[PDB]
Each structure stands twice: as C-alpha cells, then as structure tokens.
Amino acid sequence: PEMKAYFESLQREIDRAYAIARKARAQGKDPSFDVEVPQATDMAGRVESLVGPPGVAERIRELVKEYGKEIAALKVVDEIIEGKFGDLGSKEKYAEQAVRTALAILTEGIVSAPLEGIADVKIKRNEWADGSEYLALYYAGPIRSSGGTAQALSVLVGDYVRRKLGLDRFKPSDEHIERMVEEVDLYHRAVTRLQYHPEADEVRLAMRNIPIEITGEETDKVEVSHRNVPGVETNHLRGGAILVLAEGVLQKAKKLVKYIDKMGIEGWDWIKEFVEAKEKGVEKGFYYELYEKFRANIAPNKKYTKEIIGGRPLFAEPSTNGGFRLRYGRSWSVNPATMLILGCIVTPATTVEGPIVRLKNGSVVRVDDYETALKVRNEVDEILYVGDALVNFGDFVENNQTLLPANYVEEWWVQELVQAIKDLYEVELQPFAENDREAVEEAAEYLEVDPDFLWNLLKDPLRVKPDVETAIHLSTVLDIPFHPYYTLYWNTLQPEEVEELQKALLGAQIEWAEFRKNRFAKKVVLENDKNIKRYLELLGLPHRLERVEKKRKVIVVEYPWSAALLTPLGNLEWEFKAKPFYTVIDIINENNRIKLRDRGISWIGKPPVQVLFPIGLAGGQSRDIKKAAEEGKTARVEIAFFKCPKCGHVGPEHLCPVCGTRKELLWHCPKCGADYPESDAKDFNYRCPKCDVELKPYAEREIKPADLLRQAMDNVKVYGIDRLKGVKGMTSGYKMAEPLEKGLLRVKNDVYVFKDGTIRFDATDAPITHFKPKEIGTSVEKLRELGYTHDFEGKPLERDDQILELKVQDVILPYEAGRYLLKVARFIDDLLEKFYGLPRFYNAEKMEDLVGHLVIGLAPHTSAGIIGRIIGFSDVLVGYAHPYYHAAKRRNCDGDEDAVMLLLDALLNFSKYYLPEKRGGKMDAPLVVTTRLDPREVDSEVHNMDVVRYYPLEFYKATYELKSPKEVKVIERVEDGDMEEKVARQLALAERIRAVDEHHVAETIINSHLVPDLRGNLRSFTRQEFRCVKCNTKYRRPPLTGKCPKCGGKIVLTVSKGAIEKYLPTAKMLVTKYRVKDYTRQRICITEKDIKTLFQRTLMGFSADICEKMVKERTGHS
Amino acid sequence: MPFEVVFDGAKEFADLIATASNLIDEAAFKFTEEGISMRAMDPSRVVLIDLNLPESIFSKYEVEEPETIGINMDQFKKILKRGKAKDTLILRKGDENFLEITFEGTAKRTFRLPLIDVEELELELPELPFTAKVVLLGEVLKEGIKDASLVSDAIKFIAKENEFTMKAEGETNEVEIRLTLEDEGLLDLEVEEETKSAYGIRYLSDMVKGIGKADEVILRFGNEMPLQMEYMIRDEGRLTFLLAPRVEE
Ligand SMILES: [Zn+2]
Ligand SMILES: [Zn+2]
Ligand SMILES: [Zn+2]
C-alpha cells in the first residue's frame, strides 16, 4: 500500500498538471485544444502508441498475460487479418498493421521501427522468376538505433503474414544477390566498419532462405554498379537493407533460433544449420587443473582477442590477467579512486574496497577510499591492481558464453564459517545477517571470539575482517582455509621464484611470537641484493624501503603482513619444491596445517536552437534573427501563416495581437493563388474547387522579421534580449511557426530547445541496487517526508546510516541538470505568469527545492517517456537510475544516454504538428507518457526485498564445472577526448611501457590517428585550394591564376603544411623516445618530405636519431 | 640518493638556468661527487649543451650517493626569476623524490617540487683539434650578434693569424665584425691556420642572450668542424656549447 499510495500521489500530481495544462491550453495560444500527450497504464498503452490499433490494449492485457506475447502477437495478427478491428482495405494495409502492431507487441513498444524504422509495407510479385507474390518491407532513414534483434524478428512476422494472407516466398535472382553483396562490401569498406563481414555464399543462400524481401529508400549517397534492377526502386545504398540483413540476422543467429523455436514456426532449419556450423572449433594438481579448464575455455580467449584487436595490441601482461576483479552481483561498480587516475559503462560506487598502489619512493600502500588517492596520487608509478567490479548473473552475453569461476570472496568464507561450526560444533549461524545472542554467544564460547565482533562480522564481512592470529587460531582447528584478505596471489609466477624466495627468507631477520600456541612472525628484515622483490611486488604485499643505513635495499615486512607472509610457507618448516603440473598453492596445501584458496583466478575488463523560426541565410553568418529584424533582411523560405476571420489579422501568431479573438489556420491552394481559411478549407474537404490539388499549409515567400519580431515583444512586454537565432529550415511536416515570446523568454532564461519543442537535456544514468543516505547526503527527516516509512528489514526509517532500497520513480540528477532544469522551471513559471496568466506550479527557487517535482525521461527510438521524480543531487556529471525506472529490455538496444524534460513543459509546449515528415534523429517525439509501473505488488514486491548481497553457495561451489551465465538454474535452485582522454592515453601508454619492461612491439593505436594525417597531408598537398580574401565559398581551380578574377584579393592556398605540423610533435616525441623498427620509415619519410618540399647538418645523432645511429650499426657490421 | 648542497647567490645560477631554458627545453641535471653536470642536446637539434659545475662553486656540498634527477627548466626558471643574488640557495633532497629549495635571505623560503623521471641518454662528446680557438669578451659578442642578426640570418666566421673577423652578407645589407689582439674587445687569439666557416646567427642570438658583460668567452670551431663556445663561471665552472654547422646556402 505504500508504493500504491505513492502511485496515487503521482496520479494526483499528474491530474493537477493536466488541470493546469487544460486551463492554460484552453486559451488557444498553442496548436492544440486539449492535452495532446496521453498517459499509458501498462505495455498495452505503449503498444498503441506506435500504430495502435485503438482498442487492441484489451486484447494485449487479456492475451499477453495469459499466452505470452509470442502467441498473443500471432493472435492479434489473426484479428487484424480476419478483420476484427475494422475494414482497412487492401491486403497491404492489413499486413502493414499486422507487422507494425505485432512488432509493437513483441518489442513492447521499446523500438520505434513501426514509426521511423519501417517506411512502408508493400506486396509485390516475383514476375521475373515465377510470377508469385511476396511481401516487401520498405525501411525509412533511422534504422541503426533500433537494435539488430527486432530487425530480424519482423521478417519472421512476415513469414506468418504470407502464411496467413497467402503470399509466396521471395526469389532473389542472381543480379539481386550480387547487388546486395556489393552493397555489403561498399557499405562495409567506407560507410561503416561492421563487426562481422558476411560471405557471398551465406548471403546468397541465407538471402534465398529469407521468406519476404526487405529494402528501403536511398539512405547513403553511394552509387552502385547494378543499376535499373527489376524489383528495386532505387540505385543507391540502402543502409536499412544491410543492417537488417547482415547485422540483423547473422548477428543474432544464436537467439533467433530460440524465438523461432519459442513461437513454433517451421521452416527455419537454415538458421539452425547456421548455428550448427558455428561448432567447428596422477601427478596433476587440482588448482592446476582448474587453470587448465580456465585456459581451455574459449570465452576468455575470444573476448581477450576482441579486446586485443579492439585496443592496444600486445602490451598487456600475458601472465597477470588484467582488468577488474570479478565480483558477481545480482541483476559495473567501479571505485572512483582510479577513474581520474587512468568496454562497458563505468558505474561509480563507494561501497566496495579499493585496489593496492605502488608509491614512488618504493613502498606499496592500498587505496581503499578516494581520499587516499588524493593524497598518494602524486607518487603513483603504475597501477598493478585495477579495482573491483560487479557482474550481474543475467548478463546478456550470447554466442555460447561460459561462466568463468568465481573469485574467493570474504562472503562465501562466512558461509564456510557457519557451515564449519554447523557441521563441527552444531552451532546454527545464519550468515549475511545478525543472529541471536544465544548462537553467537556459544559460538563465541567455542571459537573464543568476541560476540560483538561476530555481530559486526556477520553484519559486514567486508568492513570487519579478523586479524591474522585469530585466523590462524581458527584455521588449525576448524580445518578451514586462511582468510582471503591476507591471502596473496601465489599463482602469479613460476615456483622457482618462490623456491628461491623462501631461501632468501631463511637468512632474513625474522622474529617469532606465540599467541594461543600460534607461532607467527612479527617482522622480516631482508635485503633485495640476494633476490629481486618483483615476485613480492606481484603479490601485492605492502612493504617499506630503506637505504639510509648505507645499505642498498633493506626491506622489512611487519605485522600483520609478516605472519600472513610466512603462513603459506608453513612457518618455514616444510621446504617448497618446484613440481611439474603442480602449482604453488597445490604444493603448499599438500603439506600444511592451514589450507588455502585461490582468490584471484578471474579478472574482467549543439545544436544552438532557440525558436522554430526558419531564417535561412538571412541572419548573416550565425543566423541571428535580431540582426535580420534590425537590418531588414527578408527570408524567402517556405512558411505558413494564419488568418483571423473576425478581426482580420494575418500572421504566424496563434492569438490575434490587436483583437482578443483567436484566429485559425490558413490554407493556401498550391495550384491557384488563393487562400482559404481553416473554416473554408474544411468545408471543401481541403480541396480547392477549381484546382484539384491538395491545399498545402505552407508556401515559399518572403519574411520580414522587422515587422514580425516587434509584434511579439509587446505581448509579454519584454525588451531585454541578447541574441536569438532560428533554424535554416523547418523539418516538421506542417512547418508551423513557433510563438516568438517563448524565445523571448528563452534568451533571458538561458535555455535551449530542440526541434521537438521540448527542453530535453542529455544525461547518463546507471542501475543501482541499494545505497545509504550518507552517500547521497540526505537527512532522515527528508526521507521521511519523501514517503519512506521502513527499510527492507521492516525497521522504521530512523537510522541515518542504514541500507535503504530505492523506489521506482526516483532519480538523482547532477548539479548541471539541477541548475539548468531549474532555469527551465523558471522559464515555465515565467511562461505562466505573463504569457498564460496562470499561477506558478513549480515555485522552485533553489536546487533542493526541485525535489518533489515530476520529470519525464525519453529514450532514443521511443514514443513514451517514463515519468520520474527528483530526489537528490550528485557531484558526478552522470546521474543515477533504478532498474525498475530503467528496465533491462531498453538497455540491450545500446541505449545509455537519455533525454530529460519536465512534465508541465511538455504539457504546455509540445505539439503534434511539429512531427518530421522525412528526416528524424534518434528519438521522434514524446508522444505518450507512462506513469503506472506497479512492480507486481503481489509477486515481485517480495522478490525485490532480498536482493541486498544475496550470495549463495551453489554458485561458488557449482562454478567450478564451467557453467554458463545463461544457466539460471544454479541461481533458481537457491532462489526458487583531446584533453582528458589524450592525457589518459599518454599516461596509460607509459604505464604499458613500464608494464612491458622497455620491450616495445609495433602497434596501431596512435597510428590509427597518424594514417589520416599522412593521407591528409599527401591528399591536400596536391590540392592547393585557392581562396581569396573577399570570397570564401568561391574556390579557385588547382592551376595557378596569379590573382582572383572575381575579387581583388590575393589567393590563399591550403596545402595542409602548417595545420598538421602541430599534431606531429605529439607522437613524434614518443616515437623518438624509443628505437623501434618497421615504423622509422613512416616517421622520417613525412618530415624529410617536408624538408625536401620547403628546401642544419647535425654533428651527430643525439636527438634520438635512429637514422645515423642505425645505419652506422649496419655499415660497421658489414 | 639524498644530498644537500648550498650555493650562495641565486641570480648567477639563474643566468645559467635562463641560458639553458632558452637553449634546451628538457634536461636532467646529473649529480656527481665532482659537481653538477649535464650533457644534452636541444630536442629541435639546434645546439648542444654541456654544463660542468664543480663542487668548488658551491659553498656547502654534501653527497651520500651520486645519482641523477630531472629538473624542469620552466618551473625552476620561474623560481629563480625574482630570486635575489643576496639570498642563500639551498638544494636538499632526502629519501623521497622531492626537491627542497630553501632560501635563506630576507625571508626563508623552503620549497618543494617533484622530480620527474627523465629518460635522458647520457651522451658524450668526442675530441679532435679545431685549430681555431679565440678568447673574446661577452659584451662584444652581444652587440656583434644582435646587430647583424637583423640584416642577415647567417654569419661567417673567419680567423687568421692575429686576425679575427665575422662577416655576414645578404641581399643589400652587409656587415663585418673585425677584431684583433690590439683591440679592446678581443683578449687572446690561438689561431694557427686559416679558418673559415658559416653558421646561423639565429642560434647565436639566443645562444648569446644569456652571456654577461665581463665574462671571458672562448670559442673553438674549425672549417668544416662544428661550433664550440665555452665560458667559465666563478673562474672554475665551465659551460660548453656545440652546434652543428649549416649545410644550407
Ligand atoms: Zn483577431
Ligand atoms: Zn486552388
Ligand atoms: Zn575573390
């Protein structure tokens, strides 16, 4: 009832915003009478947002919940084809509504393919092959932001369409297949470098196996050789046909068989054979065997190949697996202590621990918090340990992904503890929570520990960790392994360094201590002259260097690191020996009283638009409207005007400036030269009686802003304006003008607008699980006022430092959105106070005052925006989201950044008439808002409570059998940059240089930027573009003319000699700083080319000149 | 590695840092028990810098173990920019890789700066006779270079037995600077045979900008041999520069 009452409060707020939107919208100052944007209750309302039909929502709620969207979609297709929603017309209309509607049902309205992806649906005939009919899908421009899965699924729908209508399969001829292959190659070589490059045989056969044909209009202006192809309308490059064909089916072939097998459609054995074609790939320790199984796996080697081809080639260490520590979580978290110091989305978090860092003076200290990094950041030499990361179990990774073995965490160790005392001392101890005083009391009696320490240990094992003597005291009795926190990564180097290492420790000054029969050393005093401490550095052991005692290097390992260091060696009792097929920990655990577990066996990882006023080039160079209205420049563009029947005012204004009556639209007949008001146009059904043409609303004519801008400043009574600019051309369908007063307030409110008429701010969010008020900086009284009553533990929300869960409609935006959207709220308030005459609704003066209001989040290629509520502010430029607020289905379409707008802003500024007709970006328009997101109060409301660090044993014990993340049964058995990035490359590259031990191998990372400089200097070198001073857009021919014949100015040439000379010393100093081969010719050929083009004999090669030094080596060797 | 050295005066060394910063951009002063030295070349291949400062220049000189540190010319140049010669320059380096520059003058200014890891390749310079060694003042070089660099960009050095001349030509503006032993700007001449060579005065401009007025300047060069110019500091230190001759017209 809490979340239900909160939903009721949200509904009341939306009702109030609708009341204000109707009292202000009723004035007629907007191109609408009522609220255009509706609200959606569930997915049924979101499906109807795209194409409808208006009334299928009942069948969606009654069939999707019962039979599933796979069967319910087919049922809806059957209802449309059989004519249950109304007589549409020809079979192309029923097939079109079935594909768009069914596509909207299967994708749950997440994609905008029925809206901006699919242009048309036309049934054609295969007259050139047999004469049978087939289905042809016409795709529009924006298709890449729709995802490759659904693009394939649509075709499957066609397989049903022709199954229900009675069409036939499409027969690609030889010319069609070769033309499509030519489009894949040309589209792949120049336009966009795809991931998987298809082969002619599989495009030929697979394309032959596709039932219906898919094509589209001209997307990329790329001419083809195969021209005038029968059955093809255009002779250009169709990006939609390639992305749906290659990246749609071939990329998702390992899931498309699951959709086909899930729906129950027969005739897709070719994709099944295609999946099958992808399957053409005593003295032995256990840990060594687990490593053999880890190496035998194809997932880490293939992903390591993709990261090694997709980045720095042959620079990472092959022995130490670089990346974050694999920390599983329930369906990313990175310590921000290493973000500013040095793919996927880097989610910031301050709950997990931090890695260890080597200082410049020789010591090694760990950095757990961000403050230490701010202190020791000035002496960081390299970053051995990257950090931690939580990987969700439902991590959607297809194409046969294996589940790598889980690291030995401190939580599973607690489970090992409660099962050890449960199996040995029969004490019942429930880990991951606080127990009663009796069980903890007797456990503290048997284990001889502190009950409070056991409370804080069971409470938080990561924060509270035992020392070394209690761990040794509890390992030699319960027969449990050593503590993971004080466990070094012994499986990081050959055992020879260990065998020599213990011998180096035999002669070291080691003092021993005895505590409860525990013989553990206190400190070790050893010299680095006998053996290198590189293995010790690889173990991550904090030590201290000292050279003031006239000795070279006397490093000392003090407590508790000394005892944790000599514990695996068995206190130097048993001698370690290098054995074949036996690792170090295997030989240690072979003869030792304390067991060990391998912890680290896994490592992972504009536009400046202010008003919709088409000004064109009349604004000068920056399209300034104020300059055109001031000077008197006219704009001969295509615009529409309105007409006032009562008064007689004609203008782009909505309300008559002179009179007090509302004016209507004007319709101009294109053929004739007459204007018809909206009242007269609707009487003749928008048809001119004389000319039998459609009356277009807009027409090309002149525009005088001197007389238009003045008529708008007196309305809202404003005079302080700085600069206002419009657009070059209206991209909407109707091309309707925007009231200028809105811009008159935007220029003084310091806000910007887009083509959709809404102020949408682009931001970046992340899914979270739980947090504390301390990390967000929110008081208990504030959270109580937000509506929070109790936590997930049932206790009332009284403790500040307490783990609290997050609700659905809660967002935490950064300071930029608070101040900006705060200025947007002031724009709405100012818009209501003088332009609409209604009282203010936001009444927000500070950033924190914005808490409590409602926002709307819109995603690319989405027709619905999820209403949210601001609850706080974060220092980081990115925001925070919720998995219920941001579902997992919308994340798979490569959508991270979202557009944030205000509720009342869209309710009072959005208009449907501003929809584009041919073009379109990543999102079209906030057509439907969604607010009801009840997360199964009876079903999932309980499942969501137990998500706070739910780490079972079946996963840690069952992960050694090389399972897959897709095998959810293991869990269900228990559940039932040129500035920052450039310097980042300069520092990380040097770290890689320090990592490879001055052994550089040829690579292409900076060369990836050096090749365009080479082809740009050589290309523009022979161009020599002549541009005079007066004329800029008038280029002169490459031959020399002496002077510009048009203007009396000297001609200026661009041979690209002085602009590229700035990026050359950037990498030239780095390349010059090392002697490497196969690259000297590219480095010295261009600079010597500049020398030969422009035209100091150096006494010798002291500037790192590999020319004289190298040739001298070869000559003297000969 | 830790060491401390106290040199009296700040401006005299600031002239060396000024000349070095105007002639090199990245250098790492190597520290030896004999003194502070630095053998490097400008990264644009214009001059060759060789600083030799014995321990006799320094008042206090305390070394534990010889080692090499890198010093930025810009930052260290800005430190001794307004540094008065009446102060007490103090260089201290302890266990950590920090540099402590304490000034004991009108106001004790204990400074601290990190020391970057310069990868300077220690390169030496070979030995061969030049047969043209002259001893001239510094001010005569100042007025002789700053006036001829405006009329031309290359200057020609010619030295004969008891004769010295530096003539530079151009389009319509010629110049020459002829000095002998009986003049008042030329101290000594050790010319044995006829010597003539051409160099770029544009390098000589910034090369001589940091010279003094009474400092004895010794030049060693040859016909096809490079240019060498060395001068002493407090009668003990030696600063030698060597630049490659111009192979152009
Ligand atoms: Zn009117
Ligand atoms: Zn007409
Ligand atoms: Zn011209």
UniProtKB/Swiss-Prot annotation, chain B:
Pfam families xref list: PCNA_C, PCNA_N
GO-annotated molecular function: DNA binding; DNA polymerase processivity factor activity; identical protein binding
Activation/inhibition comment: Inhibited by interaction with the PCNA inhibitor TIP.
Transmembrane segments: none
Lineage top rank: taxon: Archaea
Record key words, sorted: DNA replication, DNA-binding
Gene Ontology annotations of biological process type: leading strand elongation; regulation of DNA replication
InterPro entries, A to Z: DNA_clamp_sf (IPR046938), Pr_cel_nuc_antig (IPR000730), Pr_cel_nuc_antig_C (IPR022649), Pr_cel_nuc_antig_CS (IPR022659), Pr_cel_nuc_antig_N (IPR022648)
CDD domains: PCNA (cd00577)
Subunit structure, interactors included: Homotrimer. The subunits circularize to form a toroid; DNA passes through its center. Replication factor C (RFC) is required to load the toroid on the DNA. Interacts with TIP.
The protein's role, per its UniProt record: Sliding clamp subunit that acts as a moving platform for DNA processing. Responsible for tethering the catalytic subunit of DNA polymerase and other proteins to DNA during high-speed replication.
Family, as annotated: Belongs to the PCNA family.
Protein name according to UniProt: DNA polymerase sliding clamp 1
Gene assigned in the entry: pcn1
